From Swiss-Prot, chain C:
The lineage of its organism: Eukaryota, Metazoa, Chordata, Craniata, Vertebrata. This is Coatomer subunit delta. Belongs to the adaptor complexes medium subunit family. Delta-COP subfamily. Oligomeric complex that consists of at least the alpha, beta, beta', gamma, delta, epsilon and zeta subunits. The chain holds residues 359 to 409 of 511 of the full protein. It is found in: Cytoplasm; Golgi apparatus membrane; Cytoplasmic vesicle, COPI-coated vesicle membrane. The coatomer is a cytosolic protein complex that binds to dilysine motifs and reversibly associates with Golgi non-clathrin-coated vesicles, which further mediate biosynthetic protein transport from the ER, via the Golgi up to the trans Golgi network. Coatomer complex is required for budding from Golgi membranes, and is essential for the retrograde Golgi-to-ER transport of dilysine-tagged proteins.
Length: 380, 51, 51
């Protein structure tokens, strides 16, 4: 409700007919209408006048007031507009306003009021609607490739893959004299999801076996967006993407308290991830936690209602904690845990097999680097 | 001796068929990764029927 | 058994000695085609091969 009541008044000192959308203003309706509409709603021949902390909108018709009352307001135009539509509907029922004829068509008017303003929100009405109801440097030549990717994952406790998707691009920065043709060879990709974009100056080659892409690179750095998958794409992490982390969550009911063990697994031991954090949520009746972890720091945070474990760099590792809970209610379902991580590989598995350049002698592929970042990575 | 709390860790199982029973005094723990079960054992021999 | 006279499906567990990976490329005006041939174990050698 914003609109307390929609009311037709006689300034005889009583609300002649009126509508209470939901039980609130019963008897209240009559006293307001009876005092205030007598004074012209205390108006001066102004449509808005407010008295005793209630907004009264009105129009005089004879010894009668057609009145809209609100004590809250959403918009200027609106309050008038419901009153106005009401004023098209009221002479159809009662041939202007007049207490005896208003009285006789209590049902008509009242029904219109419910229809016009429903639970205090100003709906619209019309006389036809109403009817249904009442019916040169090449020494320098070098090339660098940077594959930046983000992976997203939703997984069950069971380890169900659910949905995943990798987003990425491979940027190339090349210092090469002349205009050299380059051929790029990459692994073959599949994607449950979809998206691939190719930079201009990218040509597609058809070969009986293997796929190839060739292009003259712009100098400096540019998104390759080569052909093949492209060097600008959304691939599905689902399609052959590796999820650097798998979290195995074992919640346990210690009884009054709860013991949670969180298992983190990384890919090959040799590779190390960085900026890893595991966010393990906790229930509202927290008490306090005791957490233990071999590597990194772990801290419980109230407010957040989550325990956050941070590890600068990890070959791979795990954490455990015991929680104390007051037990209101019954058991609560767990919310998913999320992780942030950085890995020096792409888990879209993009591999740059070979980029051979022509128009000249061998350039040096000084470096190829891979930056892998976590997107929305969630596991229950 | 004493009453010691024990935590059991086992591999994760699946079953086309169905049936699992847990002894009382078996608690279930929820962990982000891995599953764990904890319980104070009755002394002597008993069916664990852990979680 | 299967028989010593049969049509078996190469599909059913037959090995295809060669897999060809064709990568056509649009050089632009021209076309560059790379054809990749793969054989089974390196030790074994095929003969009379033509692509």
């Amino acid at each position: 409700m914003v609109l307390l009541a929609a009311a037709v008044c006689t300034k005889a000192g009583k609300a002649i007919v009126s509508r209470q959308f939901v039980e609130m203003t019963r008897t209240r309706i009559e006293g307001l209408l009876a005092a205030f509409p007598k004074l012209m709603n205390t108006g001066k021949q102004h449509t808005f006048v407010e008295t005793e902390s209630v907004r009264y909108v009105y129009q005089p018709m004879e010894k009668l007031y057609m009145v809209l009352i609100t004590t809250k307001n959403s918009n200027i135009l609106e309050d008038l507009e419901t009153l106005r539509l009401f004023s098209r509907v009221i002479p159809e029922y009662c041939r202007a306003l007049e207490e005896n004829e208003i009285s006789e068509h209590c049902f008509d008017l009242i029904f219109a009021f419910d229809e016009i303003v429903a639970l205090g929100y100003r709906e619209n009405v019309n006389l036809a609607q109403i009817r249904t109801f009442t019916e040169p440097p090449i020494n320098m030549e070098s090339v660098h490739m940077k594959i930046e990717e983000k992976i997203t994952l939703t997984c069950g406790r069971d380890g169900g893959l659910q949905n995943m998707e990798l987003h990425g691009m491979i940027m190339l920065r090349i210092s090469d004299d002349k205009f050299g043709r380059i051929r790029l060879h990459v692994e073959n990709e599949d994607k449950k999801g979809v998206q691939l974009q190719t930079h201009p100056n990218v040509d597609k080659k058809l070969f009986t076996a293997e796929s190839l892409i060739g292009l003259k690179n712009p100098e400096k750095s540019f998104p390759v967006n080569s052909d093949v998958g492209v060097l600008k794409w959304r691939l599905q992490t689902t399609e052959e993407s590796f999820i650097p982390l798998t979290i195995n969550c074992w919640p346990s009911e210690s009884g009054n308290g709860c013991d949670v063990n969180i298992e983190y697994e990384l890919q090959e031991d040799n590779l190390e991830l960085n900026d890893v954090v595991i966010t393990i949520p906790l229930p509202s009746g927290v008490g306090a936690p005791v957490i233990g972890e071999i590597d990194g720091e772990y801290r419980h945070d109230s407010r957040r209602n989550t325990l956050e474990w941070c590890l600068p760099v990890i070959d791979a590792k795990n954490k455990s904690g015991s929680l104390e809970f007051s037990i209101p209610g019954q058991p609560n379902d767990f919310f998913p845990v999320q992780v942030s991580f950085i890995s020096k590989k792409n888990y879209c598995n993009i591999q740059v097999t070979k980029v051979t350049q022509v128009d000249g002698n061998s350039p040096v592929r000084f470096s190829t680097e891979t930056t892998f970042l976590v997107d929305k990575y969630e596991i229950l």
